[PDB]
Amino acid sequence: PQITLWKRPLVTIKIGGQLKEALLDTGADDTVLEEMNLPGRWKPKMIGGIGGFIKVRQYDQILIEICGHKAIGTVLVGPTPVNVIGRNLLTQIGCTLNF
Amino acid sequence: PQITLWKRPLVTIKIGGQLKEALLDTGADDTVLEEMNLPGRWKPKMIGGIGGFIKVRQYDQILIEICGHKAIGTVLVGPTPVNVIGRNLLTQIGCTLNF
Numbered sequence: 001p002q003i004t005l006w007k008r009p010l011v012t013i014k015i016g017g018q019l020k021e022a023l024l025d026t027g028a029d030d031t032v033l034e035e036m037n038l039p040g041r042w043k044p045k046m047i048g049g050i051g052g053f054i055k056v057r058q059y060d061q062i063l064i065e066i067c068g069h070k071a072i073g074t075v076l077v078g079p080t081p082v083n084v085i086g087r088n089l090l091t092q093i094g095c096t097l098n099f
Numbered sequence: 100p101q102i103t104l105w106k107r108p109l110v111t112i113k114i115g116g117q118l119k120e121a122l123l124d125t126g127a128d129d130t131v132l133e134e135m136n137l138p139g140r141w142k143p144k145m146i147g148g149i150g151g152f153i154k155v156r157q158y159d160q161i162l163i164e165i166c167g168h169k170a171i172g173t174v175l176v177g178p179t180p181v182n183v184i185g186r187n188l189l190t191q192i193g194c195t196l197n198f
């Protein structure tokens with residue numbers, strides 16, 4: 001699809017077999033999801049945003065489907081205010097910015 | 100142009116007479132610029148993301164040229180680590196997400 005930006009670019013995702021809503025976020029290097037139970041091994045990591053740094057659980061090689069497009073990659077889980085889909089997965093679904 | 104997302108989508112902007120690098124950020128509702136001394140009236144605002152909130156100064160009807168495309172709108176200035184072009188100006192330059 002071609003998505004305009006007068007509204008938040010929110011899309012449905014599927015992760016861990018569960019449906020969620022997430023924001024397509026070209027300003028995010030990484031994909032960061034609100035706290036949830038997720039099957040897979042994880043390691044603790046720190047990530048910084050506009051307000052400071054938070055602790056997250058890093059899950060490697062996670063299956064995640066984004067608006068019908070399948071990806072497999074790193075998903076960070078922690079106290080983010082919003083589920084954000086970052087560039088690590090936006091590249092996998094072939095996403096570009098155009099103007 | 101078409102901008103792939105392998106790397107951060109940094110473009111050159113012109114604002115307040117200065118050339119700067121800024122992120123084309125679909126996850127940002129508002130445009131937020133690193134500390135600079137703009138003229139004119141402003142009002143305080145708090146914006147939140149990963150890590151919490153930062154206090155910023157809100158300037159209205161600011162002219163910004165983004166990769167050769169002119170825009171005018173609300174610009175927030177504060178201790179952000181990165182210059183962020185948000186959806187309020189991305190729509191004005193005709194920017195879409197495509198996949």
Ligand SMILES: CC(C)CN(C[C@@H](O)[C@H](Cc1ccccc1)NC(=O)O[C@H]1CO[C@H]2OCC[C@H]21)S(=O)(=O)c1ccc2c(c1)OCO2
Pocket residue numbers: 023025026027028029030031032047048049050051082084086124126127128129130131146147148149180181183185
């Ligand atoms: C978290 C999302 C919902 C909001 N953010 C825009 C993001 O694109 C932000 C933009 C951002 C980029 C770099 C540093 C700080 C902010 N990126 C970010 O936090 O990404 C983190 C996750 O991946 C990592 O790569 C970048 C930081 C890490 S933001 O910068 O906090 C932000 C910008 C404009 C706003 C706002 C919040 O509230 C209203 O107007």
